[PDB]
């Protein structure tokens, strides 16, 4: 993977530097590294392809060494050189999508293309140049067993889940106290409801709880709080916990009440914020415990008396709510973010070429599924993909 | 408030902003705030010219007549701003256009600027509307001062033109008073 | 094991009978012996499996609130409107559309308070006259001597059902007609599902609720405007689906009575 | 002009002479007893806004001779309607067929059976003295509870009637045994509300149901009620908030040009 | 980037600029209806929002598709882009935040004001397609989350209303047959692109370039030019992206890149 | 980028950090009533929320301006940031979903609650001004 990655950035670094009428001082140790290059991969033939529509390729290497001895470059050289690089990269495109698109459940993290198992030979080891990016830098601490990182801005860490519990209900659901909750992204929106408006509960206050795992533990991550949820404040038809029937939900919201939001990291309370909103700061954490109450308004106008009665007709229903987004964390394993494009960009050559569904990823690298059952081995393969994948884009656009 | 001031003059979007402005800039010809030749000037000479043939016409007829002239004569009529070698040209069917004057390139209309301009600056009655006039310019040498006079609706080029017979100009004029109906 | 009650529920984002209330007016003016056969085959058309619909006659309203029996999943009473009965009507709706648990009241021993809002003294009977007399804190009565009647307030008289709603808190020496009444200290639990009221005339004057603030109107309150009764019929024949959607089964209750002894 | 078919309307969210007819019973104007009130009812229309001659007045000796095919001619019509303790039903509907769009189809009850085919068909039947009786036949074409040939056997569901709205079980048969002699029965279909007409009652309790429908008695923006001692009074309060009931009240749909190949009136 | 991009441009290659959450819809706030009456009772139609990155679209029906064949009525949106996108990451959210409220909206025409009053339902059968020259690249039906659009350049989506067919006494009261609708059935979907690759430059909102530019110009009081439209309105830009209005925009983006490099 | 604007200080030459999303607004949530009375019924203002880098402002009128000059009623939002920002790009957007649902709000003393039942038009005449 290192020499993928070496292949990689040296070809970038050529495209970038090997420019016309550069001073050769510019150029000398690029030039060094690009010929120790031509010299390891000389002689040497690679086939990449052959699984699903991806076509199956052949690749040479018979190259003279670039020049030492100009000045500043000159258009020849430059030709010469992107002639050269133009191959070279046509060869890591396809090295990094061969890769890409396979999987194993057994040895996940080792190379699955036949030429990256050809490259991880120890003869290719001089091609190593540096190893500056994120992502194989990362890789490098892993084979390591060091302690890794990846900064993400709104991390894609919940699974897709818009769901309702119902703590009080009948076949009529027309008297319901319970919670409604939308996890998605980096977002949690959380409402809880109660159709008597907590006039018979204790204290006349309701309690509400949700609990947020998630399936890897991020750190110093950035979190906006918000009072309310806007995605259950508006009237709605819902059908029922069997799909039977439906009932409907006409929403009048109010302040949550006594606000707690904790951040545990193996049950034990790292982080705890009492009615504080904004941004605030979760250091490290694996799930979130959102506690918020719904307290009937000790006083009330008649319009709000008006709405609120003690009989069974309410038509009106008490509603608190919480908002809770990831604005950016850090987390020792891959996951898909709402900046960077490897996710997109691994499905996307998947799509491309058809390739079956495989016995690690979902169909489709469906991310939903993938972080629900985020297992070792699809973490082990998934950050294979993506170091390729990010790889890949150093030199395609 | 179209433009950076708001006035009583300046009270797709852009269209039926500028067909708006340009319905009420022609009240600008009667408080007497052009330049050059007004679409009511050549309303008012066809209304003479066809009085004076008319055998059909009743005392009784001609108030009714000559007050229609003046509120129908030109339904669709143009007026332009022009600001240090820019013009913003609308009509009130929609149409508006923004160009430079000595290469006659359109340029994006900017609403805002024409309200400002053409709330107290003179607004020129467009006799030569700007697709008449890019196509004289194609197919003719129009001068400098051709184009300026053009432009400022002088009378002097104007009859130059005509006599001069190009077809052009002539059509235009006439599409002019044809559209003198009643 | 209960109904797995107490454990949450997550969600993600013909057979039955029906039983047609109406009075004794209706039949006599339809005038048809075959008119409950018309009405069942009408109700098979609609999509009611022949010997599901059955057909109730009642007096008055005044006789039909002595002790109403609820019998089939879904429960239609036609009440015909009067001008001076609307406190009877508004407390027969009451009784039949709202579940009630009640307890015995011998009140010849004992003094009763009513709890809370929700606790009412339901009189059902012959001929009911209820005179209450509140009791201070030493149990002397304010406003009235325990030991002559005479002295009791009136709060209903010669009446068929009353929902009595005395002040909460205080209690009360109770004189009622035993022989032909009963009383019972009821509460009421909420809606019941199963049973719906289609008043005929009249001007939306049902108040279901003790509370003088809010006098609601639930979806199983109609009201129509009605000249013959076989209009009506057709009417709750053609639109019984509304009817029906308005109404849930699941209400019913083992027995048929309009409330629980202490259940 | 394209007539007859319906094509999608976009608008966008971010951009910013009539006549009136009113409909009066015979007792306001005898307890009005003045021969000019009319006269000046218009002139303080007038001062309202409305052009002298654009204020139409209808009188009409009781609902139930009004109820007799009622005309309503006008942009804006305004009917005020007197309410009676015994004539809930009749106001009931008489609201309904003038406040609904009514397409209506003959009836010839002598030679077929009639159904209704859906909630939004009935049968309005109007005239002197309207009696209908109906009898519902099963699927052998012989009736349910009442003979075919005896008329007697039929279940009668209007008497003497000047306006009736009939509805039926749907789906099944009906013959029919009305007095056609004074009284026509047509079949008619809801197709929707009526803007042009508003009814303003006067007295009572709010006692009118538009809809077959038991489950629902709506009361729309048309239908309005004050309470009256007065018939100036009355009259007063319609011409000073005229402008409050043409704005509950709208233009007729089915008059429009769109209209035009869409059950135009 | 903008420079390797250049170049690669000069030297005929694909280009490739990364965009998070790009700019890349016009804003464009409108309404359609499919069936309407002077008065506005009883209306169905469709009502989107198209803003930077996001589609908000809602389909309503004031029957609550009552009559409609299978008690279901069908809404579907077309949005086109002026530039192909290729792997996008988006995000499909199955309710219309934008359009849950009630509403006093003017007319098509202008002339008056109807209410709408929205009650919210479950989108059925959403399909969401992204398509390239009109043949289906991506298709994703009823899912929602993240989804991934490796290249397209019209966005299709489909959602029906329909009818609950069973339906507790409170919503049954909610949804008549008659003609009075208090409540609107109201279905809707939300769209939002992430992050995405286009061969063209674009505004975004992680960069700033079009912000330099435009501050540069207003700061000069720089005329209105023959190419960009008054302002350097990115609504304009977007909606008229000529392929001369595009070629402006590089070179002055590039330009800007290269200054910010120094200037802070 | 942070050690090269650190070098700029320390010179006294321009510094300048790149924001995406500046956290710029401190947390407020708040409302003001112009027009106001204890039963809460008839009451006319703005409510906002200024955080992080969004402002979501609403102006409100319980009489739909019926007896207001013109039938125009006027709001004003005034947000002074605690830093000069330069080259921004900002969104702006005709509504205000924060403030468009039914909601129980205390009083501004906390005696009592009253309630919000917004019905949400096209505000016109939109100004926003950018000052330094
Ligand atoms: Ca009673
Ligand atoms: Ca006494
Ligand atoms: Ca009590
Ligand atoms: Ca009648
Ligand atoms: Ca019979
Ligand atoms: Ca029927
Ligand atoms: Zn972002």
Same mark, same amino acid.
């Given at each position: 993977?290192?020499?993928?990655?070496?292949?990689?950035?040296?070809?970038?670094?050529?495209?970038?530097?090997?420019?016309?009428?550069?001073?050769?001082?510019?150029?000398?140790?690029?030039?060094?590294?690009?010929?120790?290059?031509?010299?390891?991969?000389?002689?040497?033939?690679?086939?990449?392809?052959?699984?699903?529509?991806?076509?199956?390729?052949?690749?040479? +290497?018979?190259?003279?060494?670039?020049?030492?001895?100009?000045?500043?470059?000159?258009?020849?050289?430059?030709?010469?050189?992107?002639?050269?690089?133009?191959?070279?990269?046509?060869?890591?495109?396809?090295?990094?999508?061969?890769?890409?698109?396979?999987?194993?459940?057994?040895?996940?993290?080792?190379?699955?293309?036949?030429?990256?198992?050809?490259?991880?030979?120890?003869? +290719?080891?001089?091609?190593? !140049?540096?190893?500056?990016?994120?992502?194989?830098?990362?890789?490098?601490?892993?084979?390591?067993?060091?302690?890794?990182? +990846?900064?993400?801005?709104?991390?894609?860490? !919940?699974?897709?889940?818009? #769901?309702?519990?119902?703590?009080? #209900?009948?076949?009529?659901?027309?008297?319901?106290?319970?919670?409604?909750?939308?996890?998605?992204?980096?977002?949690?929106? *959380?409402?809880?409801?109660?159709?008597?408006?907590?006039?018979?509960?204790?204290?006349?206050?309701?309690?509400?709880?949700?609990?947020?795992?998630?399936?890897?533990?991020?750190?110093?991550?950035?979190?906006?709080?918000?009072?309310?949820?806007?995605? !259950?404040?508006?009237?709605?038809?819902?059908? #029922?916990?069997?799909?039977?029937?439906?009932?409907?939900?006409?929403?009048?919201?109010? /302040?949550?009440?006594? *606000?707690?939001?904790?951040?545990?990291?193996?049950?034990?309370?790292?982080?705890?914020?009492?009615?504080?909103?904004?941004?605030?700061?979760? /250091?490290?954490?694996?799930?979130?415990?959102?506690?918020?109450?719904?307290?009937?308004?000790?006083?009330?106008?008649?319009?709000?008396?008006?709405?609120?009665?003690?009989?069974?007709? !309410?038509?009106?229903?008490?509603?608190?709510?919480?908002?809770?987004?990831?604005?950016?964390?850090?987390?020792?394993?891959?996951?898909?973010?709402?900046?960077?494009?490897?996710?997109?960009?691994?499905? #996307?050559? /998947?799509?491309?070429?058809?390739?079956?569904?495989?016995?690690?990823?979902?169909?489709?690298?469906?991310?939903?599924?993938?972080?629900?059952?985020?297992?070792?081995?699809?973490?082990?393969?998934?950050?294979?993909?993506?170091?390729?994948?990010?790889?890949?884009?150093?030199?395609?656009? | 408030?179209?433009?950076?001031? %708001?006035?009583?003059?300046?009270?797709?979007?852009?269209?039926?902003?500028?067909?708006?402005?340009?319905?009420?800039?022609?009240?600008?010809?009667?408080?007497?705030?052009?330049?050059?030749?007004?679409? @009511?000037?050549?309303?008012?000479?066809?209304?003479?010219?066809?009085?004076?043939?008319?055998?059909?016409?009743?005392?009784?007829?001609?108030?009714?007549?000559?007050?229609? %002239?003046?509120?129908?004569?030109?339904? $669709?009529?143009?007026?332009?701003?022009?600001?240090?070698?820019?013009?913003?040209? %609308?009509?009130?069917?929609?149409?508006?256009?923004?160009?430079?004057?000595?290469?006659?390139?359109?340029?994006?209309?900017?609403?805002?600027?024409? %309200? @400002?301009?053409?709330? @107290?600056?003179?607004?020129?009655?467009?006799?030569?509307?700007?697709?008449?006039?890019?196509?004289? $310019? @194609? $197919?003719?040498?129009?001068?400098?001062?051709?184009?300026?006079?053009?432009?400022?609706?002088?009378?002097?080029?104007?009859?130059?033109?005509?006599?001069?017979? $190009?077809?052009?100009?002539?059509?235009?004029?006439?599409?002019?008073?044809?559209?003198?109906?009643? | 094991?209960?109904?797995?009650?107490?454990?949450?529920?997550?969600?993600?984002?013909?057979?039955?009978?029906?039983?047609?209330?109406?009075?004794? =007016?209706?039949?006599?003016?339809? &005038?048809?012996?075959?008119?409950?056969?018309?009405?069942?085959?009408?109700?098979?058309?609609?999509?009611?499996?022949?010997?599901?619909?059955?057909?109730? =006659?009642?007096?008055?309203?005044?006789?039909?609130?002595?002790?109403?029996?609820?019998?089939?999943?879904?429960?239609?009473?036609?009440?015909?409107?009067?001008?001076?009965?609307?406190?009877?009507?508004?407390?027969?709706?009451?009784?039949?559309?709202? =579940?009630?648990?009640?307890?015995?009241?011998?009140?010849?021993?004992?003094?009763?308070?009513?709890?809370?809002?929700?606790?009412?003294?339901?009189?059902?009977?012959?001929?009911?006259?209820?005179?209450?007399?509140?009791?201070?804190?030493?149990?002397?009565?304010?406003?009235?001597?325990?030991?002559?009647?005479?002295?009791?307030?009136?709060?209903?008289?010669?009446?068929?059902?009353?929902?009595?709603?005395?002040?909460?808190?205080?209690?009360?020496?109770?004189?009622?007609?035993?022989?032909?009444?009963?009383?019972?200290?009821?509460?009421?639990?909420?809606?019941?599902?199963?049973?719906?009221?289609?008043?005929?005339?009249?001007?939306?004057?049902?108040?279901?609720?003790?509370?003088?603030?809010?006098?609601?109107?639930?979806?199983?309150?109609?009201?129509? &405007?009605?000249?013959?009764?076989?209009?009506?019929?057709?009417?709750?024949?053609?639109?019984?689906?509304?009817?029906?959607?308005?109404?849930?089964?699941?209400?019913?209750?083992?027995?048929?009575?309009?409330?629980?002894?202490?259940?």
């Amino acid at each position: 993977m290192d020499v993928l990655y070496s292949l990689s950035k040296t070809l970038k670094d050529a495209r970038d530097k090997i420019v016309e009428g550069t001073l050769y001082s510019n150029v000398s140790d690029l030039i060094q590294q690009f010929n120790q290059m031509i010299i390891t991969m000389n002689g040497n033939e690679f086939q990449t392809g052959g699984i699903g529509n991806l076509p199956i390729r052949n690749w040479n +290497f018979n190259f003279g060494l670039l020049g030492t001895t100009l000045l500043n470059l000159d258009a020849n050289y430059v030709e010469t050189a992107r002639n050269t690089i133009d191959y070279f990269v046509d060869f890591v495109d396809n090295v990094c999508m061969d890769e890409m698109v396979r999987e194993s459940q057994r040895n996940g993290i080792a190379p699955q293309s036949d030429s990256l198992r050809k490259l991880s030979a120890i003869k +290719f080891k001089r091609i190593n !140049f540096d190893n500056s990016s994120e992502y194989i830098e990362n890789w490098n601490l892993q084979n390591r067993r060091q302690r890794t990182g +990846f900064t993400f801005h709104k991390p894609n860490i !919940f699974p897709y889940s818009a #769901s309702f519990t119902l703590n009080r #209900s009948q076949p009529a659901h027309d008297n319901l106290m319970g919670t409604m909750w939308l996890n998605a992204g980096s977002e949690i929106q *959380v409402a809880g409801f109660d159709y008597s408006c907590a006039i018979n509960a204790p204290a006349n206050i309701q309690q509400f709880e949700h609990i947020v795992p998630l399936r890897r533990v991020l750190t110093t991550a950035t979190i906006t709080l918000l009072p309310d949820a806007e995605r !259950f404040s508006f009237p709605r038809v819902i059908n #029922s916990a069997d799909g039977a029937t439906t009932w409907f939900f006409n929403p009048v919201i109010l /302040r949550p009440n006594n *606000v707690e939001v904790e951040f545990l990291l193996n049950g034990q309370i790292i982080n705890t914020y009492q009615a504080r909103f904004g941004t605030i700061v979760a /250091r490290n954490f694996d799930t979130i415990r959102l506690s918020f109450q719904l307290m009937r308004p000790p006083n009330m106008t008649p319009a709000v008396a008006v709405l609120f009665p003690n009989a069974q007709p !309410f038509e009106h229903h008490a509603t608190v709510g919480l908002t809770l987004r990831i604005e950016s964390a850090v987390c020792e394993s891959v996951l898909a973010d709402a900046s960077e494009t490897l996710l997109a960009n691994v499905t #996307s050559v /998947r799509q491309e070429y058809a390739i079956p569904v495989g016995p690690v990823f979902p169909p489709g690298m469906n991310w939903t599924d993938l972080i629900t059952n985020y297992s070792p081995s699809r973490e082990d393969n998934l950050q294979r993909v993506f170091t390729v994948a990010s790889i890949r884009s150093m030199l395609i656009k | 408030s179209i433009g950076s001031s %708001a006035s009583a003059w300046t009270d797709s979007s852009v269209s039926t902003q500028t067909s708006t402005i340009s319905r009420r800039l022609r009240l600008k010809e009667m408080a007497t705030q052009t330049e050059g030749m007004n679409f @009511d000037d050549i309303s008012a000479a066809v209304l003479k010219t066809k009085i004076d043939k008319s055998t059909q016409i009743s005392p009784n007829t001609i108030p009714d007549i000559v007050t229609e %002239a003046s509120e129908k004569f030109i339904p $669709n009529r143009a007026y332009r701003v022009i600001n240090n070698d820019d013009v913003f040209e %609308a009509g009130i069917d929609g149409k508006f256009f923004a160009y430079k004057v000595d290469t006659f390139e359109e340029i994006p209309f900017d609403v805002q600027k024409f %309200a @400002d301009l053409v709330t @107290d600056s003179p607004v020129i009655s467009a006799i030569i509307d700007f697709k008449t006039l890019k196509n004289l $310019n @194609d $197919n003719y040498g129009i001068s400098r001062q051709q184009a300026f006079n053009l432009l400022r609706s002088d009378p002097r080029v104007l009859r130059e033109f005509i006599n001069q017979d $190009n077809p052009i100009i002539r059509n235009r004029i006439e599409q002019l008073i044809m559209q003198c109906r009643l | 094991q209960n109904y797995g009650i107490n454990l949450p529920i997550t969600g993600s984002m013909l057979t039955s009978t029906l039983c047609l209330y109406y009075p004794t =007016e209706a039949a006599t003016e339809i &005038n048809d012996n075959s008119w409950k056969d018309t009405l069942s085959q009408l109700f098979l058309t609609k999509g009611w499996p022949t010997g599901s619909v059955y057909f109730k =006659e009642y007096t008055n309203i005044a006789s039909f609130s002595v002790d109403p029996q609820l019998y089939c999943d879904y429960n239609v009473v036609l009440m015909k409107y009067d001008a001076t009965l609307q406190l009877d009507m508004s407390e027969l709706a009451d009784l039949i559309l709202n =579940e009630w648990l009640c307890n015995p009241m011998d009140i010849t021993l004992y003094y009763y308070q009513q709890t809370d809002e929700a606790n009412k003294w339901i009189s059902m009977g012959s001929s009911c006259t209820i005179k209450v007399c509140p009791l201070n804190t030493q149990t002397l009565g304010i406003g009235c001597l325990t030991t002559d009647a005479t002295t009791f307030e009136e709060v209903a008289t010669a009446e068929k059902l009353v929902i009595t709603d005395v002040v909460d808190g205080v209690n009360h020496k109770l004189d009622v007609t035993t022989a032909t009444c009963t009383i019972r200290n009821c509460k009421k639990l909420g809606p019941r599902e199963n049973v719906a009221v289609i008043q005929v005339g009249g001007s939306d004057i049902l108040d279901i609720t003790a509370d003088p603030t809010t006098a609601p109107q639930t979806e199983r309150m109609m009201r129509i &405007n009605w000249k013959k009764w076989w209009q009506v019929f057709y009417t709750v024949v053609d639109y019984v689906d509304q009817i029906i959607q308005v109404m849930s089964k699941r209400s019913r209750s083992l027995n048929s009575a309009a409330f629980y002894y202490r259940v």
